[model samples]
Target: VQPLARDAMAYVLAGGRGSRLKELTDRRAKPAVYFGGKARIIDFALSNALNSGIRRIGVATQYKAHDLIRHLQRGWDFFRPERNESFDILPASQRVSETQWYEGTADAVYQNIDIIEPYAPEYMVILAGDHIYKMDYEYMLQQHVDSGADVTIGCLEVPRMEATGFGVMHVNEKDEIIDFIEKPADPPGIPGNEGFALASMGIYVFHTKFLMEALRRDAADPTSSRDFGKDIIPYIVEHGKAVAHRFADSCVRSDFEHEPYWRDVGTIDAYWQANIDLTDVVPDLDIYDKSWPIWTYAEITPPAKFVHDDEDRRGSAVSSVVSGDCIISGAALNRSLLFTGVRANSYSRLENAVVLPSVKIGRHAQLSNVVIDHGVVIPEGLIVGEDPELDAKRFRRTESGICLITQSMIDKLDL
Candidate 1:
């Protein structure tokens, strides 16, 4: 059979509160969080859908979604409806329930069923909008058709201990899902690999009719949680032909030896680490691939500039990823990621920091091992990430000792 990408419409779930990210999600949804000094978390999924030939897409939003909606409107409004390709924003507006919002992942799509039905797609591709990865959905769609399955889940091998946090699955040699469990306390390990378990990547391809039936059935059950992992997949596995598609088969790899890169940047630590890793000599996630590019809104700004060549106040960044219009004036950045239009002034030192867009770092300010939120002005002569007790008293410090600085945190500063 031909690829199903052309026949499929994707629904990207972009409504997570991302409480673990703390202040980062206070004003925006998890998928709207800044990533890699350029893109948002949802960009990965949307870009994958675009590159894989899936034209019609819908992004469902709930939690503080103003930021996410603005991004979609500004960045993803390129699709032409006249040509049968369009990106739609499906926000919760009591579509099905009068008082309740999206109770779970599956319900988010169910609430938008009225809008989706009009698309007349053969397959429905459900994607997690908060993950960072490069994947080709066309291959997964073809696998679903070739396997003669009613639904196919995209999954990857995760350590058995970590599998408790994910939807675990047991597949036979034929790749048919024999058993499925949602976040089991004692996850069943893969048959041959006792230390590992197949964990769902929250990506699924379902026949349009099969999905409609499942959603309607789930809506009728008062006992159901309205979640795909908690209710839908298990019910389908028992009654219908449900299969698993290993991510390694569909993952977009830049090099032969590179492992399939997928990251859930749900926490402050995870977000910081993911962005910091991009500054590595050879990062795990290759965002520079022209063939499979990660798409986002391109801000019009001048090229990054570094000033001052004096011995005492030389401006330079070593092994760092700096974005456009950034000015490192008489400052030094070591292994940091600077977003667009940031200004680091004289005699300042930024080490292992992830500074968001338009931030102004004042002169003689020293920062280390920190994640600074957007547009915050670091005061002059301020020193952070030095004394553990001092940092804990003022800022939110993670277990890994990464300090999180926001405008509110800076507002409370004495200086």
Candidate 2:
């Protein structure tokens, strides 16, 4: 049995300024973005923290964090601080120095050290709130305890394209980190496996004393950027106290014998692809696994209902996920995902599409390969994704021809 190690605390970096996601993140923080019909992006981090046996957590929030904050208050209210099993949403208080916000990742935690130090944790688990994956972190902690290392980072072998997106690392035979680079211009693949490179997962376990001291030194350095990947990890590796824990062999404790799955949904294309993966026969990320279930805040809605049974106007979904309280009136949806409270009018056809919550589909509206934002009302007899030039005049169309319709587009666009 693993030793009781509840003294370690976790911190999820949720204040990402999602410039790549654009309109989806204009109002809400990226972590608050919806996913898998009913789950938010931040739900993964929160669930991972609890499932990994770390109850106390601190989520650093910034950059239009209303939705993110509300999501925590609504869903994560169960974690009680009175008993030390707390989940605190730490916002940018500027307490360290007034009129200054979080400069970078390390600075964010450094400024809030005063509030977190009270917990007196022996180890600090730093994580990014946006990634999608499942793994038991206890094994890594055990490894850290056994090795007595100053810092341990989670690493995985990813393709060259992905290598440039994450912090790529070069490790020796013993898995000791040799060198690191963040978002490198050259996608340097590992030896023999030239198509892939070892990339950092932005998941780190640090000795509390070492972490605090690094942050202190970084805060004082005039040229330092104060980021874990770009600064702290580099210092530890040069000092020969840093190591890597491979993610593929991590103790995930999965419901099936499936291979490890991890995706960093940082851009629009990746985000869309990840959601589309859910429509498969068996999603790579199994939300239904009783062994490791993904939890989220759900609305009080009734079961979905269908009407108009005739073949010409059959209200049925084929290989699609229609969420609760949706009324499908002879609207055929194939390989699509409809969020809660959607009203599909008669004779509408949707295929390979993702419809957001509370959206109203007008009669005879045909949409294929499209993403409809929340509260959008498609006008009657409208067709999207059939022609790119026509749709581009009214909506935003990616280079790959995936049409995007926001609520503002529905409010202003004639279509």
Candidate 3:
């Protein structure tokens, strides 16, 4: 087991609605959204924290947090409070102000000060719960302690073209962040590597005292958006000892040769693409790593079953990730991800599809480049993703031509 971040208290911000995911966030928070067959997005963050021995964690939730709260209670309630290991569900209860909810990213933590102050940890680690990646927070915390920095921000070297989506920052020779901007229109590249820019990973570590002071200061600022990236980091970068901790330095690599996998599935197109990529021969995101297992609350189910083996009626999946209790009854799946308890009937063909849990695909159904939402039932002989125009009329189609079919959409269709 890795050495614990004994002096650190971690808070995972899982409150975003992730509106960019379109209909996917209609019912659930982003972190509670399903991913990688059986796990939710928040599972990755919680797993990383636990794996790094940061047992005391607070998951802050808002905007349709019921699903997220339920998942935490079911899967993460095993921590023993007597051992200083507690998995807390910190919902926005207007604890700080009666009329105000979580006003901003920093405000979310600020509102939970009453709950966090009792822990009185030496270090505070704030993490984004919606991201997908494996990290060792111990490394980042250690770096903060060794560098004698007041605050440390986790950053990753993303393509310069994509840096606009994140907080871009410049680090000096000593790795101290000197300049920072949130979602810059034209992000500047690293001094030597013009093709890449250092982008904030929404992961931050602060001296507990400094964090409390900063949050208190930001709360008092009338002009501040109350966001860490937009207001807090910038002020600290200019006035205090703020360092940039590279993700490559702290990532939990699956292997020596593969690059660390981190994804922001914030859009429908990106979500579908990432799920489809999981079906690759050598997928970038390896879910099979036993040493660093992703934790989640999975219902008890029998093994996935495949029936019928004839040439035309073969129940097989190639380059796919099929979860437990799924039944491929004479259907074929190529480059697809089948969530738990899915049923694809005879003659159904799914290519580059992401079928969420408990979905039922009837016989002769042809789906490609689509995301079938949870509990959706695709009628027999139905075809989708074959015609952009038709799909646009029947379902939620993105600019990238990927269809998001929910139960409501399916219900509206004339089956």
Candidate 4:
């Protein structure tokens, strides 16, 4: 079959409390949280949309959306205002109704349905904002059209251990979904595969009419979770023509010829581990893939400089992902991710850590397995990670005890 028409519209679900990320999502929306070295988590989805030639997009935002809005304003203003093709950030303004806020993912889209109708798109692509991966939705969109289905749910094979958190599916030889269950008490393992199950990736492609009808029907169900996987997908499967598209290793990143890398950085441990994963020798996910660039909004800063010095106390960073305009004295750093304009003073050490933009690490300080937020200055000769109790008293600790040092907390602690 020929490719699906390019006249599809994209909608991003950005509203969520993100309680699993704890302090990282404490101030900003989950999508705005810093990821990799220079990009936020939402950049992956937005970049995928932009690269895939989908120009019109609506990002539905809710709780703590200011930071996300700011990032979009700064980094994603590439589209011309005069062009009919535009990228817009749609927060929960309630222009049409005085509802409190988006009750769920489906509800968020339902509230914005009136706005989307004007675009007159044949298909609607819905995506979650907090996932980390690079995908070209055009391929999936083509599959949906070829299958002649009302709704096509994108699915990935997740380990059985992780299948409990997602909607599991069973598909026939023709790739038509035969069974669907939402976070089942006894999650079904994929046929012929032990310890693995096909789970919804929270990505969907729906016919315009099907989406409108489903949303209208779902809005009336008071007991529904008001979510796509929980309510709409199951309902459409039982009542309407719907199919689950099994995501094979080959279906990922249609533009690239390598193993795909995707992550749901929702929990604190998962978030921290995702960052640290970049520091691996041959990381499973390669952000530097020039063929598939990950775009983001970043402040323009001077090129990173490393000055050689004879004194052992001079700051120095080795084997780290350092952004622009960083000043390294004789500090010893290994396996760390540093953003633009960061300063590491003499005699300090940072290892397996992430230092945000414009942060200053004073002389004689030590840090390990920590994430220091923006604009914070570490006091001189202060020992961190050497004592768990001392670090706990000052910074927010994750379940794995990774120290989260925010700018506000740094000021309060006088560090």
Clashes of each: 0, 0, 0, 7
Best by TM-score: 1
Q: Write the per-residue lDDT of candidate 2 for residues 39-105, one digit (tens) a residue.
A: 8888887787788888888999888988899889898888877778878788886566784578788
The C-alpha stretches of model 2 lying farther than 4 A from their native spots are: 1-5, 94-96, 185-195, 251-257
Q: Per-residue lDDT tens digits of candidate 3, residues 318-389?
A: 888899999999999998999998999999999989999999999999998899999998999999978899
Q: Compute each candidate's TM-score over C-alphas.
A: 0.96, 0.94, 0.95, 0.92
Please say which candidate is ahead in lDDT: 1 or 3: 1
- Show pairs that collide, candidate 4: 314-329, 314-330, 315-329, 315-330, 315-331, 316-330, 316-331
Model with the higher lDDT, candidate 1 or 2: 1
Scored by Cα lDDT, where does model 4 land? 0.79
Question: Which residue pairs come into collision in candidate 1?
Answer: none
Ranking under lDDT, best-scoring first? 1, 3, 2, 4
Off by over 4 Å in 3: 1-4, 94-96, 310-312
Worst 10 residues of 4 by lDDT: 249-258
RMSD of 2: 2.0
- The true-structure Cα RMSD of candidate 3 reads 1.9
Q: Write the per-residue lDDT of candidate 4 for residues 265-334, one digit (tens) a residue.
A: 7776677778877777677777677766778886667887666577555456666788888888778888
Model 4 residue 12 CA deviation (Å) reads 0.5
